Amino acid sequence: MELLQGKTFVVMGVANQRSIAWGIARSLHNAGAKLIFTYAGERLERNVRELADTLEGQESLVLPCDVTNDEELTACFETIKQEVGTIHGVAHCIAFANRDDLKGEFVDTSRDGFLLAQNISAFSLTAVAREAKKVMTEGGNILTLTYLGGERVVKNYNVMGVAKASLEASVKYLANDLGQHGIRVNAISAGPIRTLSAKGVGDFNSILREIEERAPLRRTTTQEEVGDTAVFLFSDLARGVTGENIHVDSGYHILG
Amino acid sequence: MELLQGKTFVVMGVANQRSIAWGIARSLHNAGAKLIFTYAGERLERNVRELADTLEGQESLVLPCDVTNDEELTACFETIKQEVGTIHGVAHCIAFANRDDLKGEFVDTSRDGFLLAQNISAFSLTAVAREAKKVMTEGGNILTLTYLGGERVVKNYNVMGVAKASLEASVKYLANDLGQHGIRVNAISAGPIRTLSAKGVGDFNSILREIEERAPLRRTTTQEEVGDTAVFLFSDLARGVTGENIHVDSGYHILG
Amino acid sequence: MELLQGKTFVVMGVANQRSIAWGIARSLHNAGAKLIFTYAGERLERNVRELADTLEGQESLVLPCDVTNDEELTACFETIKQEVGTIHGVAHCIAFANRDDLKGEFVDTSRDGFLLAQNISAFSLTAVAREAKKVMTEGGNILTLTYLGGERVVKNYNVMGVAKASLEASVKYLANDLGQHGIRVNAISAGPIRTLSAKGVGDFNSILREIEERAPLRRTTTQEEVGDTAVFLFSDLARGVTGENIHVDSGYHILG
Amino acid sequence: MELLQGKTFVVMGVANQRSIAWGIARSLHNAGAKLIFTYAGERLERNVRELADTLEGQESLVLPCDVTNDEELTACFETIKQEVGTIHGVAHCIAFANRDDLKGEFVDTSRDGFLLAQNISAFSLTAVAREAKKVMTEGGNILTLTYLGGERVVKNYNVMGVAKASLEASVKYLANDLGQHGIRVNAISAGPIRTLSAKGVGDFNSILREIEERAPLRRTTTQEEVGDTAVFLFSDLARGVTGENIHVDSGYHILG
Ligand SMILES: NC(=O)c1ccc[n+]([C@@H]2O[C@H](COP(=O)([O-])OP(=O)(O)OC[C@H]3O[C@@H](n4cnc5c(N)ncnc54)[C@H](O)[C@@H]3O)[C@@H](O)[C@H]2O)c1
Ligand SMILES: NC(=O)c1ccc[n+]([C@@H]2O[C@H](COP(=O)([O-])OP(=O)(O)OC[C@H]3O[C@@H](n4cnc5c(N)ncnc54)[C@H](O)[C@@H]3O)[C@@H](O)[C@H]2O)c1
Ligand SMILES: NC(=O)c1ccc[n+]([C@@H]2O[C@H](COP(=O)([O-])OP(=O)(O)OC[C@H]3O[C@@H](n4cnc5c(N)ncnc54)[C@H](O)[C@@H]3O)[C@@H](O)[C@H]2O)c1
Ligand SMILES: NC(=O)c1ccc[n+]([C@@H]2O[C@H](COP(=O)([O-])OP(=O)(O)OC[C@H]3O[C@@H](n4cnc5c(N)ncnc54)[C@H](O)[C@@H]3O)[C@@H](O)[C@H]2O)c1
Ligand SMILES: Oc1cc(Cl)ccc1Oc1ccc(Cl)cc1Cl
Ligand SMILES: Oc1cc(Cl)ccc1Oc1ccc(Cl)cc1Cl
Ligand SMILES: Oc1cc(Cl)ccc1Oc1ccc(Cl)cc1Cl
Ligand SMILES: Oc1cc(Cl)ccc1Oc1ccc(Cl)cc1Cl
């Protein structure tokens, strides 16, 4: 409501209306924050601008940011500095892997396919954290989105699971680095949600019914449940929480 | 100020101003919640009553509830059902072990001691949950406090460590049971905090100092940081969070 | 092979020819070990003495030992000390919980059933390790059997899951106490196996069918696979392994 | 003495007498296995050939295999195929990261340093498995060596910790892919041992003294304890174990 009043956050990864990052943006805005959006490339610019503009308030800054490109990533955060000077956090909702690796056997993943997944889905957290460390002059929280596949084997998640494991270990090492700089680093492990990228995981419809049937809360997750947990982590209420991975998956993670 | 407005919660475990339960009480109260307190035996009625009255708004119910007593436990929740219509959660901050067993080697723990710690520090959660369920129509969240010692070996924690491990598994199984009924069950794993029961844990000062020197946030936690994470878990913001264990310990849990 | 020549181990838990403890006995025997068997009640002395005799040229010591009875427990190892003097390990394969509690919801577990399960399935490892220590003057290993349900929520496991969590934490703390005396403590988390006690777990056939179809090895575990892993753990090949939990479940534990 | 008789294993990562892979080689040899060795580059050809010759009996195949190079990888395994035909396993003991990244803040790791560690220390396992799979027509085990730094934050391990988390997740996805082909994939999480590349880790003597004082067994690990646990994983005694990470660290991993 006013939980994030006066704070400005950088949300990375909105692609369209179903993006979990969009769910995060709406929750942060409703909690009173100001936002900055970064999108992967020119193709997405229109979607993010129009989405950003549905939010009441000042025209939000929308900037291209291919996290695979160091010069653009660095220039993006320099622009952010010149524009607002200080931000209070970054929501990192980025991941990618060649579609053909998310099927069949993980053992057939090509080297380039594996490094690509690692580069975009795990390293980008660290590269982003490094630039955000510069503008988060008042400390704050850095968030990332992970998935159960990084902790245990999920069918067809393959190289993405290995990349998330690496992302989750990154959260821990970054939390270890940044805490003394007043910066908390956390992850949200969301349960399956229908998004543009969900199309790369096989038989999604049946995965969702499995969640509805077996998850403790008997229902699938929503972008809003994730965004609201994100509000907590970016807010002062989470002051003592860092290097933590919170599962917003209707409790599915406890099932053996 | 309004996050918990219109909600009523039971805070079990207040012994004095330093109790973690009290920090939770204050946080819930500052978030607009109505509180009902439960104390162990008569010796603690005066203390709790006093602290409760120090809050404002309508006076708070203060009921005796010794978790080793099934009758007094069922009576307490009977009173609550009659006095208040519904509650939206319970904050379980109860634990006990004989100081004798918290010294030296765990292999020397008596069957009596081991069963006593299990009964009070772990089973109580379930006992409380079965009663809470009766007055928790509309749903809500059940919270309990645990410690790292239930996940790994912490010097001197011994039998309490094994108790917390049960508590922690109990959280998972209860979450699995109660989710269909709209009830979430989560735990907060707090870092060392200076409390009455902190005397059983030998050489606390060295403990607080190692945390300040090695924890990512370079500070020990407080009853308020825990209180604030509880506000989150009892709120609708934590809608899809259940069967989780959130470490409010300055990030110490990630260290190896 | 001949890994255990001249070593003597106590196998507690044989009840059946299908008992996992018996699978361990046979493997220990084939690796050249001398065994001492203990059985719950007179009701089982017949089967154990009978099975124990089927081993080639052997002393075949078989003593009674109800782990809930401190007198018997103490007399059993006193007898062992008098007749053998020094043993090199103990296989703790004991567990129990009222069948009622293995049904329906965990929240309805009664206080006595919960403590019954903890006393028999978890504390006994400690009570046994305490006596065993007196007779393991050359170091050695203490093994116990746990199951996945102690780490994550497995349906129809309820109170056993929580007793197993205490058991697994007990392993860690005992390992921590005993390592300095040259004594290692480890667990084997076995996958579902048709034993007498497995009849207490609902719809076992489908449980086995699921392991067969989804476990990495596409087959269910056998008492022999567990036995052979016990051989490694009691042998010197595992002298650097303590406080560990080895899943002998065709890799099922890794599945998310 | 003949646990691995008739079996042939490929050991990757011998650099010198103090390498953990050399400890594994002696252990596998003592148990009767035949060995094929691979070295990183010309520089090590000598050292490895000399150590191999020491394993009297049969002139062991010693081949170059830079895991960074696709052709060498293919060349090495096609040679084993044409030369030996069938192997029963591979011991993967390879890791690398720039020294500068193993100090200071992990957040400062460069994209290249990060992808380099991932490539050599994590992907290499998969590339090796893809090739080994072609010559393990009879099944068998693939082993890798990880470290606590991949599960939890270990000071200065930084990027290697993230690489190891990635390696550990890979062990699981590979176990899940190769199990149906009769191939098990496992890891040994070795405790700190004085090796050639251990010089890259912070004050090693104080690290070792810490383990000697805190570790359950009150002693540091050796290449032999690792080698003996490797013997088990490659033997038929471990046929039911896959996707597992056995800690051969004197029990240190259990400490909180
Ligand atoms: N949808 C789910 O069920 C689910 C569950 C758990 C975790 N996640 C994670 O949440 C995040 C967001 O995923 P989503 O499900 O909303 O899908 P999405 O397709 O909406 O978002 C993925 C985002 O990554 C961006 N991206 C890819 N390469 C990029 C690059 N090189 N530079 C900058 N951005 C790049 C895409 O533009 C997109 O905005 C991902 O990390 C994903 O793994 C999703
Ligand atoms: N203080 C810390 O450092 C710390 C850290 C992590 C977790 N915890 C946990 O938080 C909870 C609260 O502990 P605390 O540190 O505030 O100590 P505390 O001594 O203030 O509170 C413990 C409470 O348990 C109550 N209790 C004991 N036996 C009871 C019984 N039979 N019936 C009902 N209530 C009973 C006591 O009255 C007391 O109010 C405990 O579970 C504890 O293990 C504490
Ligand atoms: N069968 C499986 O699928 C499976 C899987 C994982 C773990 N386990 C564990 O392995 C152990 C052996 O179980 P099992 O499956 O061979 O079944 P089982 O029924 O053959 O053996 C259980 C043993 O516990 C003994 N026991 C019960 N109460 C006792 C008491 N008061 N004092 C002494 N002994 C007592 C019984 O006599 C019996 O010998 C148990 O801890 C069990 O939880 C079994
Ligand atoms: N020494 C320890 O305390 C310890 C603890 C836990 C895990 N480990 C792991 O054990 C493995 C062996 O390490 P070690 O301690 O024996 O050190 P080491 O220096 O003897 O071995 C490291 C090996 O990696 C090889 N290597 C590097 N780049 C390579 C490449 N491109 N292609 C092929 N091989 C390459 C090196 O030649 C060397 O043989 C590593 O994975 C290491 O992380 C070591
Ligand atoms: O991580 C995810 C988990 C689930 Cl269940 C669904 C979608 C996910 O997100 C992705 C999956 C594959 C690729 Cl290539 C990119 C992204 Cl963002
Ligand atoms: O769990 C705790 C953890 C820490 Cl570090 C300090 C105090 C704790 O709380 C207790 C410790 C011992 C007993 Cl007998 C009862 C309680 Cl409530
Ligand atoms: O732990 C077990 C796990 C599985 Cl899958 C099957 C049997 C098991 O063993 C038991 C189950 C229930 C009770 Cl009451 C006692 C025992 Cl020994
Ligand atoms: O993983 C390790 C863990 C420890 Cl305690 C000691 C040495 C280790 O091994 C390495 C460390 C750094 C680099 Cl660059 C390469 C290797 Cl093989």
Q: What are phi and psi of A132, to 5 degrees?
A: -65, -30
Sign of CA dihedral C240, C243, C249, C251: negative
C-alpha B44, offset from chain centre: 17
Residue C249: its chain D contacts at CB < 8 A? 240
C-alpha A255, offset from chain centre: 24
Residue C242: its chain D contacts at CB < 8 A? 216-217, 250-251
C-alpha A196, offset from chain centre: 14
Sign of CA dihedral B49, B51, B52, B57: positive
Distance, in angstroms, between B254 CA and closest chain C CA? 18
| C-beta D211 within 6 A of ligand 8 | no
- What is the C-alpha to C-alpha distance for residues B62 and A23, in angstroms, rounded to an integer? 41
Q: Measuring CA to CA, which residue among D252, D224, D253 is closest to residue D19?
A: D224
Burial code (b: 16+ CB inside 10 Å, e: under 16) for C181-192 equals eebbbbbbbbbb
> Residue B121 has what DSSP assignment?
I
Quote the ligand 6 centre to C118 CA distance (angstroms): 21
Residue A160 contacts by C-beta under 8 Å, 6 or more apart in sequence? A95, A97, A101, A102, A117, A121, A147, A149
Residue nearest ligand 6's atom 5 by CA: B192
| C-beta C192 within 6 A of ligand 7 | yes
- What is the C-alpha to C-alpha distance for residues C171 and B191, in angstroms, rounded to an integer? 23
Question: Is residue D192 a contact partner of residue D205, using CB atoms and an 8 Å limit?
Answer: no
| C-beta A196 within 6 A of ligand 5 | no
Burial code (b: 16+ CB inside 10 Å, e: under 16) for C225-253 equals bbbbbbbbbbbbbbbbbbbbbbbbbbbbb
Residue D184: its chain C contacts at CB < 8 A? 216-217, 251
Quote the ligand 1 centre to A21 CA distance (angstroms): 8
Q: Measuring CA to CA, which residue among D191, D207, D197 is closest to residue D102?
A: D197
CB atoms within 10 A of CB C217: 27
- What is the C-alpha to C-alpha distance for residues A53 and A42, in angstroms, rounded to an integer? 17
Strands A89-92 and A8-12, by their bridges, are parallel
CB contact under 8 A, A173 and D150: no
Strand-pair partners of C187: C144, C245
Residue A127: its chain D contacts at CB < 8 A? 111
| C-beta D208 within 6 A of ligand 4 | no
- What is the C-alpha to C-alpha distance for residues D125 and D12, in angstroms, rounded to an integer? 10
- What is the C-alpha to C-alpha distance for residues D206 and D212, in angstroms, rounded to an integer? 10
Strand order across the C245-248 sheet: C61-64, C34-39, C8-12, C89-92, C140-146, C183-190, C245-248
Residue A30 contacts by C-beta under 8 Å, 6 or more apart in sequence? A1
Q: Is C199 exposed, middle or buried (0-12, 13-18, 19+ CB in 10 A)?
A: exposed
- What is the C-alpha to C-alpha distance for residues C15 and C118, in angstroms, rounded to an integer? 20
Pick the atom of ligand 8 nearest to D146's CA.
1
The token pair that represents C16 in the structure block: 């059946």
- What is the C-alpha to C-alpha distance for residues C254 and D170, in angstroms, rounded to an integer? 11
Q: Is D1 exposed, middle or buried (0-12, 13-18, 19+ CB in 10 A)?
A: exposed
Strands C140-146 and D8-12, by their bridges, are unpaired
Helix (H, G, I), strand (E, B) or coil at B241: coil
Q: Known binder of ligand: residue A66? A: yes
Q: Is B193 exposed, middle or buried (0-12, 13-18, 19+ CB in 10 A)?
A: buried
Residues on chain A bordering chain B, Cβ-to-Cβ distance under 8 angstroms:
1-2, 172, 175-176, 178-180, 184, 191, 215-218, 221-222, 225-226, 228-229, 231-232, 236-244, 246-251, 253-255
Strand order across the B34-39 sheet: B61-64, B34-39, B8-12, B89-92, B140-146, B183-190, B245-248
Q: Please report where in the chains the tokens 């220590």 appear, as a residue.
A: C133
Q: Measuring CA to CA, which residue among B169, B196, B213 is closest to residue B96?
A: B196
Residues on chain C bordering chain D, Cβ-to-Cβ distance under 8 angstroms:
1-2, 172, 175-176, 178-180, 184, 191, 215-218, 221-222, 225-226, 228-229, 231-232, 236-244, 246-251, 253-255
Residue nearest ligand 7's atom 11 by CA: C197
Q: Which helix (H) or strand (E) holds A124?
A: helix A124-135
Q: Measuring CA to CA, which residue among B183, B176, B193, B188 is closest to residue B243?
A: B176
Q: Is C15 exposed, middle or buried (0-12, 13-18, 19+ CB in 10 A)?
A: buried
- Indicate the angle between helix axes C42-53 and C20-30, nearest 10 degrees: 30
H-only helix segments in C17-94? 20-30, 42-53, 70-83
CB contact under 8 A, A154 and C254: no
Q: Which helix (H) or strand (E) holds A253?
A: none
Nearest CA in chain C to A150: C256
In chain D, how many H helices and how many E strands?
8, 7
Quote the ligand 2 centre to B56 CA distance (angstroms): 25
How many beta-carbon contacts under 8 Å exist across B and C?
A: 102
Q: Please report where in the chains the tokens 């310990």 appear, as a residue.
A: B249
DSSP string, C98-152: -GGGGSS-GGG--HHHHHHHIIIIIIHHHHHHHHHHHH-BTBEEEEEEE-GGGTS
CB atoms within 10 A of CB B44: 16
CB contact under 8 A, A255 and C152: yes
- What is the C-alpha to C-alpha distance for residues C219 and C250, in angstroms, rounded to an integer? 7
What angle is formed at CA B47 by the lines to CA B41 and CA B48, rounded to 5 degrees?
A: 75
> Residue A122 has what DSSP assignment?
I
The token pair that represents B24 in the structure block: 């939770």
What angle is formed at CA C246 by the lines to CA C245 and CA C248, rounded to 5 degrees?
A: 140
- What is the C-alpha to C-alpha distance for residues D256 and D249, in angstroms, rounded to an integer? 15
What angle is formed at CA D17 by the lines to CA D16 and CA D23, rounded to 5 degrees?
A: 110
Strand order across the A244-248 sheet: A61-64, A34-39, A8-12, A89-92, A140-146, A183-190, A244-248
Question: Is residue C36 a contact partner of residue C9, using CB atoms and an 8 Å limit?
Answer: yes
Residue A7 contacts by C-beta under 8 Å, 6 or more apart in sequence? A32, A33, A34, A88, A89, A140, A234
Q: What are phi and psi of B92, to 5 degrees?
A: -95, 105
Q: Which amino acid is at C16?
A: N
The token pair that represents C28 in the structure block: 């220990």
C-alpha C61, offset from chain centre: 18
- What is the C-alpha to C-alpha distance for residues B219 and B209, in angstroms, rounded to an integer? 9
Of D126, D162, D168, the CB nearest to A107: D126
- What is the C-alpha to C-alpha distance for residues D44 and D16, in angstroms, rounded to an integer? 8
Half-sphere exposure (Cβ direction) of B90: Cα atoms closer than 13 Å: 28
- What is the C-alpha to C-alpha distance for residues C17 and C19, in angstroms, rounded to an integer? 5
Question: Is residue A223 a contact partner of residue A23, using CB atoms and an 8 Å limit?
Answer: yes
- What is the C-alpha to C-alpha distance for residues D5 and B254, in angstroms, rounded to an integer? 43
Question: Is residue D30 a contact partner of residue D223, using CB atoms and an 8 Å limit?
Answer: no
- What is the C-alpha to C-alpha distance for residues A251 and A255, in angstroms, rounded to an integer? 8
Of B118, B129, B174, the CB nearest to C118: B118
DSSP string, D79-122: HHHHHHS--SEEEE------GGGGSS-GGG--HHHHHHHHIIII
What angle is formed at CA C81 by the lines to CA C79 and CA C82, rounded to 5 degrees?
A: 65
Strand-pair partners of C36: C10, C61
Half-sphere exposure (Cβ direction) of B218: Cα atoms closer than 13 Å: 7
Q: What are phi and psi of B72, to 5 degrees?
A: -60, -30
Q: Is B18 exposed, middle or buried (0-12, 13-18, 19+ CB in 10 A)?
A: middle
Strands (E), chain A: 8-12, 34-39, 61-64, 89-92, 140-146, 183-190, 244-248
> Which other chains touch chain C, taking contact as 3+ CB pairs less than 8 Å apart?
A, B, D
Q: Just list the catalytic residues of A.
A: 147, 157
Residue B85 contacts by C-beta under 8 Å, 6 or more apart in sequence? none
**Left, alpha or beta for D139 (phi > 0: left; psi -120 to 50: alpha)?**
left
Strand-pair partners of A166: none
How many beta-carbon contacts under 8 Å exist across A and B?
A: 124
Q: Measuring CA to CA, which residue among B89, B101, A116, C126 is closest to residue D115?
A: A116
| B158-to-B57, B123, C134, C187 alpha-carbon distances in Å | 42, 18, 20, 18
Question: Is residue D164 a contact partner of residue D150, using CB atoms and an 8 Å limit?
Answer: yes
> Catalytic annotation on D252?
no
Q: Which amino acid is at C172?
A: K
Q: Known binder of ligand: residue C67? A: yes
H-only helix segments in C136-246? 158-178, 204-214, 223-234
Residue C115: its chain B contacts at CB < 8 A? 115, 118-119, 123
Question: Is residue A238 a contact partner of residue A232, using CB atoms and an 8 Å limit?
Answer: yes
- What is the C-alpha to C-alpha distance for residues C87 and D199, in angstroms, rounded to an integer? 41
DSSP string, B138-206: T-EEEEEEE-GGGTSB-TTTHHHHHHHHHHHHHHHHHHHHHGGGTEEEEEEEEPP---GGGGSSS-HHH
User: In chain A, helix, strand, coil percent, each to 5?
Assistant: 50, 15, 35
| C-beta C140 within 6 A of ligand 7 | no
Q: Which amino acid is at D85?
A: G
Of C152, C254, C255, the CB nearest to A254: C152
| C-beta D62 within 6 A of ligand 8 | no
- What is the C-alpha to C-alpha distance for residues D190 and D245, in angstroms, rounded to an integer? 10
CB atoms within 10 A of CB C206: 9
Question: Is residue A37 a contact partner of residue A25, using CB atoms and an 8 Å limit?
Answer: yes
Q: Which amino acid is at B185?
A: V
The CATH topology of domain D1-256 is Rossmann fold (3.40.50)
Question: Is residue A133 a contact partner of residue A184, using CB atoms and an 8 Å limit?
Answer: no
| B247-to-B30, C11, C69, C173 alpha-carbon distances in Å | 22, 40, 39, 21
Q: What are phi and psi of D35, to 5 degrees?
A: -130, 145
Of C149, C153, C254, the CB nearest to A152: C254
Of A151, A152, A256, the CB nearest to C153: A256
Q: Please report where in the chains the tokens 């410690």 appear, as a residue.
A: B147
Strands B89-92 and B8-12, by their bridges, are parallel
- What is the C-alpha to C-alpha distance for residues D61 and D53, in angstroms, rounded to an integer? 10
Strand-pair partners of A64: A39
- Indicate the angle between helix axes A124-135 and A70-84, nearest 10 degrees: 30
**Left, alpha or beta for B20 (phi > 0: left; psi -120 to 50: alpha)?**
alpha
Q: Measuring CA to CA, which residue among C134, C58, C149 is closest to residue C90?
A: C134
Kindly calculate the radius of gyration of chain A based on its CA atoms and give it in whole angstroms. 17
Q: Which amino acid is at A200?
A: G
Q: Measuring CA to CA, which residue among B231, B128, B248, B115 is closest to residue B191?
A: B248
The token pair that represents D138 in the structure block: 């009879």
- What is the C-alpha to C-alpha distance for residues D212 and B131, in angstroms, rounded to an integer? 49
Residue nearest ligand 8's atom 8 by CA: D198
Q: Measuring CA to CA, which residue among D1, D7, D30, D63 is closest to residue D234?
A: D7
Distance, in angstroms, between C253 CA and closest chain A CA? 8
CB contact under 8 A, B114 and C133: no
The token pair that represents B168 in the structure block: 């922690």
CB contact under 8 A, C173 and B163: no
The token pair that represents C116 in the structure block: 């019954």
End-to-end CA distance of chain D: 38
End-to-end CA distance of chain B: 38
- What is the C-alpha to C-alpha distance for residues B203 and B220, in angstroms, rounded to an integer? 15
> Which other chains touch chain A, taking contact as 3+ CB pairs less than 8 Å apart?
B, C, D
CB contact under 8 A, B166 and C170: no
Length of chain B: 256
Strand-pair partners of D39: D64
Residue C218 contacts by C-beta under 8 Å, 6 or more apart in sequence? C212, C250, D179, D180
Q: Is D121 exposed, middle or buried (0-12, 13-18, 19+ CB in 10 A)?
A: buried
The token pair that represents B223 in the structure block: 């009853």
Pick the atom of ligand 7 nearest to C98's CA.
14
- What is the C-alpha to C-alpha distance for residues D228 and D25, in angstroms, rounded to an integer? 10
DSSP string, D23-60: HHHHHHHHTT-EEEEEESSHHHHHHHHHHHHHS-SS--
Dihedral (Cα; B13, B19, B21, B27), 10-degree rounding: 160
Q: Measuring CA to CA, which residue among B100, B212, B117 is closest to residue B156?
A: B100
> Residue D154 has what DSSP assignment?
-
Helix (H, G, I), strand (E, B) or coil at A116: helix
Quote the ligand 5 centre to A106 CA distance (angstroms): 15
The token pair that represents A223 in the structure block: 């972008």
Distance, in angstroms, between C253 CA and closest chain B CA? 17
